[PDB]
Amino acid sequence: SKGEELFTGVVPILVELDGDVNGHKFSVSGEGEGDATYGKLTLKFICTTGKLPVPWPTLVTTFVQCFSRYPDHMKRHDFFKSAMPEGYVQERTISFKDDGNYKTRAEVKFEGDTLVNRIELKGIDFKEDGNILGHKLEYNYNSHNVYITADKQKNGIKANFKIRHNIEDGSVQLADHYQQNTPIGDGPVLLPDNHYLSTQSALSKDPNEKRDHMVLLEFVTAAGITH
Ligand SMILES: [Mg+2]
Ligand SMILES: [Mg+2]
Structure with missing residues (x-):
């Protein structure tokens, strides 16, 4: 199909988020590239407003599942690439157990040859010294x-999943994720059978970067269907 062919090589990625969490307003810009042939993403994010008022890990899922590797036998289930280049809206409610929630609305689409994720994030009901506003997450x-x-x-x-963020005391902060995606354009899109994205992510710091930032290396493979 047309949208899957846009991902056979390395594709540059831009991420732009504006956020308001309990009235703390912030913005993040990210850049990197994805290689969906290998389910691979490499991204670097910078808080452009100063210090990020929430922990970096809490934003990982919000900051491009079109770069998932769909095995050849599963290509007919790849909604994300099928919506390209016109793209899709991705909306989530992220519910932090015993704490606040994020509501995110993003548009993921091509601008020229660059895959863009533009996000608005709103967080409310956070506890001032909870794990999020208290910066207690590893x-x-x-x-x-x-x-x-x-x-x-x-x-x-739609998608549902549970992210577990490690707390500095060794405990875990659950972030329930509920997700909806809708295509922006008028091209045909693939409506998938039930399956899952097996996702692994590693966070690091650029030793030369003094702005508040996050480096993300992520691998994602679609799974759960055998033929
Ligand atoms: Mg291929
Ligand atoms: Mg631990």
């Missing part, structure tokens, strides 16, 4: 499965 990331189901009435998909 700078690391666990592996998780993203469970995808079709949403035919919206010509799109």
